[PDB]
């Protein structure tokens, strides 16, 4: 049920500004956790978190031309499924 509609608002060879749909006020969580990594097979992803009131997030320091997978998780598995996208910088 949350979050919804993960998409890259803006993009640069090194950075991606992404956003999602937090849902209705009763669905808003206390924080989301975001995970970005090389879509290949190197498991040391990079991870950070974002306050539940924020619906956007910027992601700097990406190698130009690479294709990354980007995942947004709610605090618990209760609320829904984590959503993810692919993007080549």
């Amino acid at each position: 049920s949350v979050p919804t509609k993960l998409e890259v608002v803006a993009a640069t060879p090194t950075s991606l500004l992404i956003s999602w749909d937090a849902g209705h006020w009763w669905e808003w969580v206390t924080y989301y956790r975001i995970t970005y990594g090389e879509t290949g097979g190197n498991s040391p992803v990079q991870e950070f978190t974002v306050p539940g009131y924020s619906s956007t997030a910027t992601i700097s320091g990406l190698k130009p031309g690479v294709d990354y997978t980007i995942t947004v998780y709610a605090p618990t598995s209760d609320y829904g499924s984590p959503i993810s996208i692919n993007y080549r910088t």
Binding site: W25, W26, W28, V29, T30, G52, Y53, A74, P75, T76, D78, Y79
Partner: protein
Amino acid sequence: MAWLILIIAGIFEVVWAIALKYSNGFTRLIPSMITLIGMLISFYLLSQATKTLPIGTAYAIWTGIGALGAVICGIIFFKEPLTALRIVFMILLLTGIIGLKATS
């Protein structure tokens, strides 16, 4: 005044008590926020009331308002069973609170 502060503190006691369960693992924002706020208010007002009122009376009346409002809200908004036992207990609680305020 200190008694009015006590009443309001018990009110906020029950508000944060219900908002806590309406939050999940402290993970629903709007409930959690209300819990955090209602707590901070409640206890603060308690700390104020305890300045002028005895700690036993203050704690007891604060707890009692919390519980009485918890049962009122449970019945009204949660389809809770209303016993005659519960009615006599609510009556005892209100009698104690009123008599304690009347013996000031």
